[PDB]
Swiss-Prot record:
Other facts: In the hepatoma cell line Hep-G2, SP1 precursor mRNA may undergo homotype trans-splicing leading to the duplication of exons 2 and 3.
Name under which the protein is recorded: Transcription factor Sp1
PTMs per UniProt: Phosphorylated on multiple serine and threonine residues. Phosphorylation is coupled to ubiquitination, sumoylation and proteolytic processing. Also implicated in the repression of RECK by ERBB2. Acetylated. Acetylation/deacetylation events affect transcriptional activity. Deacetylation leads to an increase in the expression of the 12(s)-lipooxygenase gene through recruitment of p300 to the promoter. Deacetylated by HDAC6 which leads to increased expression of ENG and positive regulation of angiogenesis.
Coiled-coil regions listed in the entry: none
Portion of the parent chain present: 654 to 684 of 785
Length: 30
């Protein structure tokens, strides 16, 4: 399964850490 964002913002990543970093733009950092 791909690491797809579903915020809808739906960028697909091959790396979980890259999805994590991406998600940092939604939450985790303000
Ligand atoms: Zn996103």
């Amino acid at each position: 399964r791909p690491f797809l964002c579903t915020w809808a913002c739906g960028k697909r990543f091959t790396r979980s850490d890259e999805l994590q970093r991406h998600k940092r733009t939604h939450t985790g950092e303000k």
